[PDB]
Structure 1
Amino acid sequence: TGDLINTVRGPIPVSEAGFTLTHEHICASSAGFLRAWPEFFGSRKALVEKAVRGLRHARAAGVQTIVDVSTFDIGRDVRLLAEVSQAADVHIVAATGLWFDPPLSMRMRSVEELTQFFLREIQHGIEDTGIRAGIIKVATTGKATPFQELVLRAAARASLATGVPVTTHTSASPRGGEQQAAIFESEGLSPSRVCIGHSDDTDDLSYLTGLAARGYLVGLDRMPYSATGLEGNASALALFSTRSWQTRALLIKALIDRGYKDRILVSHDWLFGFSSYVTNIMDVMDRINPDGMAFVPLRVIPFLREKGVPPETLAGVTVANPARFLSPT
């Protein structure tokens, strides 16, 4: 009680976030795209309706909060987030930061300028909406580019100023997480403010326990991205692993069994629209995972419980760890 987090509908008590998915998207797009070309998604109205149905399904399954880690260059539309949050009765935390598609107007900026932009979105609000980011999303693509280093440093600085956590995208080992950690630490950022994302891309337990031992949160955040019979489909095969989802889920158990239950965040990296990839990709995705963002609560959590993970431990992972991560600290 007492701690607050910013959502797209305003401030909420941390203790009300409940079962929280820490890496999700309503729509993965590009800056300006939803506004310039809503018909790409059928219509803005069809996108809202699909997202609200999806989030109502997740809510029925026990999900109370999602963290939408869509940055400016993922075409985050905070008005869309607010509308869907209100219609679905699911809290949504919005993000600042930058992903791997920054336009020239971002790429030309200094660390100090990027810091000011992240702080504006956290402290003032996004665009002219007054809605404030509750997380900072950064991405490196293999070995950090020089601009990516600036982004990571600007993220660390904005976090230090605000207590808001940082969450990352990594390529599949690299293993890019270690370089990100090195940059964050050089800026004096506490690892407990940081989630190293897409850490389920590989079953490298030494990499993962290495990060966890240092205080980092490990984002096991692509839980439903497993499929069979996609070889005649190059673009779909790129997204979906041959590893069963059971294998991804066993990584959560592996980390719990090694003493790191407090260092784990679980999510889907799901979405209801996707213009930054091939056309009609959603048809493929929705056929594979019709449960959408209810996949974790419906499938992953019962599987772990059935494998002997205690309910208190599962509660800790899905409720306590997100609460501690999101609480400005």
Structure 2
Amino acid sequence: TGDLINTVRGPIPVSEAGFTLTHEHICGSSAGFLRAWPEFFGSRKALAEKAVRGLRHARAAGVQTIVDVSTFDIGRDVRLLAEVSRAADVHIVAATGLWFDPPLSMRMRSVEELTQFFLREIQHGIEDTGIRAGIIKVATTGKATPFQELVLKAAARASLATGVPVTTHTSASQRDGEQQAAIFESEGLSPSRVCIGHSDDTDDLSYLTGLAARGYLVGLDRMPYSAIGLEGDASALALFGTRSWQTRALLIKALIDRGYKDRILVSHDWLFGFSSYVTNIMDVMDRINPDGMAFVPLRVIPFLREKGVPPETLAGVTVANPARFLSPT
């Protein structure tokens, strides 16, 4: 009791986050896009109503908090998050940092200047809203570009100044987490402040337990992603992959059986609109997983319990681990 985390409706006690999905999106977009072209999504209103329905579904399934890891360059719209959060009655933590689509006004910046940007969003507020970020989001897709190295150092420095954790996009098959960890540690950032994300996109347990052993959180955060049955759709296939959700969920069990229950975070990487990909991708997605952000509580948790993972363990994963991660430290 007494430890606080920032949400888009203001500060909440850590102990009130409850069942928390630590890597999700309301809308996967680009900076300025929802302002310039809202009809792409039907309308902003159609978008918000879809999002509220989704989050109410997740809520009815026991989800109390999502961490929306949309950065600036994912076109994060913190006013939109606040509105859907209020209407659905689900807590949303917003993000600072940069994903892998930074425009030139960011790409030209120094590590110092990025640190000041990330600190602004955490300590002052995003835009003119006063809504403060409660997590820093970074990305690589393979070996870090030169600019990506600065982003990761700036994320570490902002995290050390504020205690707010860092979470990452990886290309899991290329084992990005190992270079991310090296860079974070060169800045003196504690591995317990760091989640290495999209780690369920691989079945390489040597890679995963190696990170877990060093104290990193391992984000198994793309649960409902499977393109099985969708072989004739090259865009669906490249994005969702050819492994089933049961295969992804088996990784959670594998890490628990190897003693790493406290190093796991689970999520969907779901969204309610998606302009940064092919047109109509959202129809394909909703067909594959009509449960949205309830898929984890409805399908994954009972699959684990039936594999014999104890209720306490499953609570520790979905409640205690996010609370410990999000708590400024």
**Runs of at least 4 residues of structure 1 off by over 6 A?**
none
SS of the equivalent of 1:12 reads strand
2:202 aligned residue: 202
Q: TM-score, normalised by structure 2?
A: 0.99
Q: After TM superposition, give the deviation of residue 226 of structure 1 in Å.
A: 1.2
User: For residues 260-305 of structure 1, what are the alpha-carbon distances to aligned partners after superposition, in whole Å with 9 as ceiling and x for unaligned?
Assistant: 0000000000000000000000000000000000000000000000
1:40 aligned residue: 40
Whole-angstrom distance in 1 between the partners of 2:228 and 2:99: 29
2:97 aligned residue: 97
User: For residues 217-253 of structure 1, what are the alpha-carbon distances to aligned partners after superposition, in whole Å with 9 as ceiling and x for unaligned?
Assistant: 0000000001322121111111222211111000000
User: For residues 3-51 of structure 1, what are the alpha-carbon distances to aligned partners after superposition, in whole Å with 9 as ceiling and x for unaligned?
Assistant: 0000000000000000000000000000000000000000000000000
Whole-angstrom distance in 1 between the partners of 2:269 and 2:50: 16
SS of the equivalent of 1:268 reads coil
State yes or no: 1:298 paired with 2:311.
no
1:61 aligned residue: 61
Q: Give runs of aligned pairs for residues 24-173 of structure 1, distance below 5 A.
A: 24-173=24-173
Whole-angstrom distance in 2 between the partners of 1:191 and 1:326: 13
Whole-angstrom distance in 2 between the partners of 1:172 and 1:179: 12
SS of the equivalent of 1:316 reads helix
Whole-angstrom distance in 1 between the partners of 2:106 and 2:240: 31
Whole-angstrom distance in 2 between the partners of 1:194 and 1:240: 25
Q: After TM superposition, give the deviation of residue 141 of structure 1 in Å.
A: 1.5
SS of the equivalent of 1:296 reads helix
- Contact 2:5 2:327 (8 Å CA) reproduced: yes
Whole-angstrom distance in 2 between the partners of 1:93 and 1:36: 25
Q: After TM superposition, give the deviation of residue 158 of structure 1 in Å.
A: 0.1
- Contact 2:268 2:296 (8 Å CA) reproduced: yes
User: For residues 183-218 of structure 1, what are the alpha-carbon distances to aligned partners after superposition, in whole Å with 9 as ceiling and x for unaligned?
Assistant: 000000000000000001100111111000000000
Whole-angstrom distance in 2 between the partners of 1:59 and 1:226: 23
Whole-angstrom distance in 1 between the partners of 2:113 and 2:193: 22
SS of the equivalent of 1:129 reads coil
- Contact 2:48 2:80 (8 Å CA) reproduced: yes
SS of the equivalent of 1:226 reads coil
Q: Could you tell which deviates more after superposition, 21-30 or 220-229?
A: 220-229
User: For residues 90-122 of structure 1, what are the alpha-carbon distances to aligned partners after superposition, in whole Å with 9 as ceiling and x for unaligned?
Assistant: 000000000000000000000000000000000
User: For residues 102-147 of structure 1, what are the alpha-carbon distances to aligned partners after superposition, in whole Å with 9 as ceiling and x for unaligned?
Assistant: 0000000000000000000000000000000000000011000000
Q: Could you tell which deviates more after superposition, 126-135 or 164-173?
A: 164-173
- Contact 2:227 2:236 (8 Å CA) reproduced: no
Q: After TM superposition, give the deviation of residue 80 of structure 1 in Å.
A: 0.2
Q: Give runs of aligned pairs for residues 167-182 of structure 1, distance below 5 A.
A: 167-182=167-182
Q: Could you tell which deviates more after superposition, 273-282 or 219-228?
A: 219-228
Q: After TM superposition, give the deviation of residue 173 of structure 1 in Å.
A: 2.4
Whole-angstrom distance in 2 between the partners of 1:212 and 1:77: 33
Percent identity, aligned pairs only, is 97
Whole-angstrom distance in 2 between the partners of 1:39 and 1:180: 38
User: For residues 37-93 of structure 1, what are the alpha-carbon distances to aligned partners after superposition, in whole Å with 9 as ceiling and x for unaligned?
Assistant: 000000000000000000000000000000000000000000000000000000000
What RMSD in Å do the two structures reach over aligned CA positions? 0.5
Whole-angstrom distance in 1 between the partners of 2:84 and 2:328: 25
Whole-angstrom distance in 2 between the partners of 1:38 and 1:304: 40
- Contact 2:153 2:183 (8 Å CA) reproduced: yes
Q: After TM superposition, give the deviation of residue 174 of structure 1 in Å.
A: 1.4
Whole-angstrom distance in 2 between the partners of 1:277 and 1:204: 27
Whole-angstrom distance in 1 between the partners of 2:322 and 2:5: 11
SS of the equivalent of 1:219 reads strand
Whole-angstrom distance in 1 between the partners of 2:87 and 2:35: 20
Q: Could you tell which deviates more after superposition, 25-34 or 234-243?
A: 234-243
- Contact 2:19 2:318 (8 Å CA) reproduced: yes
Whole-angstrom distance in 1 between the partners of 2:82 and 2:296: 23
SS of the equivalent of 2:30 reads coil
Q: After TM superposition, give the deviation of residue 172 of structure 1 in Å.
A: 2.5
SS of the equivalent of 1:173 reads helix
Whole-angstrom distance in 2 between the partners of 1:273 and 1:266: 21
Whole-angstrom distance in 2 between the partners of 1:299 and 1:174: 29
